[PDB]
């Protein structure tokens, strides 16, 4: 596929897709092309205006080759506090921004806890956080609790 992305000024660009591609892959390509984090993208089908559905195949929601989606970018990025609970069950508070990468948070937790950052990983609502992704990818909210998990050696 090749898909048209239309922004508020009316400017357009193209993104290369496929039949097995999900909204997540679509947003990834958009980040590739314009440098906006996936969690900051607000997308809808043109010109129906229907929001894109995260769990549903692009092809199952009226998109195909030549289609156009509308993009609005939401760069609101005020600080919030979250908690990271260590192996001993002590929670500590961290001021973060959702645009900050997981690797960035790990550096903060590493300093506070005294554990090298290669010796733990973080989880939220069960799933592991990937170093290179922004915190906002994971839908962290004010006072959300992330879990520190120690790498055994």
């Amino acid at each position: 596929w090749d898909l048209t992305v239309k922004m508020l000024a009316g400017n357009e660009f193209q993104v290369s897709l496929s039949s097995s591609m999900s909204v997540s892959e679509l947003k990834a390509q958009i980040t590739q092309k314009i440098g906006v984090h996936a969690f900051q993208q607000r997308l809808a089908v043109h010109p129906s205006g229907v929001a894109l559905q995260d769990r549903v195949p692009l092809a199952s929601q009226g998109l195909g080759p030549g289609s156009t989606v509308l993009l609005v970018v939401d760069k609101s990025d005020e600080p919030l506090s979250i908690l990271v609970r260590n192996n001993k069950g002590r929670s500590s508070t961290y001021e973060v921004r959702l645009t900050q990468t997981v690797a960035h948070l790990k550096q903060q937790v590493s300093g506070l806890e005294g554990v090298q950052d290669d010796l733990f990983w973080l989880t939220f609502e069960g799933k592991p956080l990937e170093d290179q992704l922004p915190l906002g990818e994971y839908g962290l909210k004010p006072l959300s609790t992330v879990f520190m998990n120690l790498r055994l050696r």
Partner: protein, 94 residues
């Protein structure tokens, strides 16, 4: 300092036509102070000349008046305020 292309010129003209509309509607509530009313009048004057200037570079069929551009501008602002394309689909189509 955000890098933008040509036609951020057109879009900003349209956006600020919407801004003017908001000032005007705010003024109807008797809530816009005297400096604010001065800002409104100046925006409208700069906008009208900017539109004049800009329409000279545009192709005949796409030279829109201030009245026409306020409508696009309002659409744009709805999109922005709700951060939702659905709020003013026509906003993307100038």
């Amino acid at each position: 300092q955000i890098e933008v292309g040509p036609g951020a010129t057109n879009a900003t003209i349209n956006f600020e036509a919407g801004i003017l509309e908001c000032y005007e509607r705010f003024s109807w509530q008797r809530a816009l102070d005297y400096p604010g009313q001065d800002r409104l009048h100046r925006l409208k004057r700069k906008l009208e000349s900017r539109i004049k200037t800009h329409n000279k570079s545009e192709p005949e069929n796409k030279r829109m008046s201030l009245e026409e551009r306020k409508a696009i501008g309002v659409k744009m602002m709805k999109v922005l305020l709700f951060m939702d394309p659905s709020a003013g689909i026509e906003g993307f189509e100038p």
